[PDB]
Nucleic acid binder design. Structure first.
Length: 76
DNA sequence: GGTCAGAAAATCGGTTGTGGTCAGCTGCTGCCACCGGTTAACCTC
């Protein structure tokens, strides 16, 4: 999750917030994982980690909070 | 060459009445914000 989180430098927060959001995503994925998938755990959890990091970046991006749909159209 | 009495003001105050108008109230009308499922795009088991 450190190697996954390293691709989000310079976007609002420092690295540590991304690291801890990746830990949160790891907790959510390891709750939401099944052993009869026959899937690699990291390849499973990458979507969850990236989702958590991106939504926390959306939440804590700016001084004034902006809703995620306007964040999306700002990105667009 | 007086003398109550009536008619008719105005004046404060009810009244009725009624008409309307608007504050608001509130169940449809419909649009608008997350939520996530899916669907064609990248890296090579």
């Amino acid at each position: 999750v450190v190697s996954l989180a390293k691709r989000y430098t310079g976007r609002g927060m420092a690295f540590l917030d991304l690291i801890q959001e990746g830990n949160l995503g790891l907790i959510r994925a390891v709750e939401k994982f099944d052993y009869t998938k026959g899937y690699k755990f990291s390849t499973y959890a990458t979507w969850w980690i990236r989702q958590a990091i991106t939504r926390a970046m959306a939440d804590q991006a700016r001084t004034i909070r902006i809703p995620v749909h306007m964040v999306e159209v700002i990105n667009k």
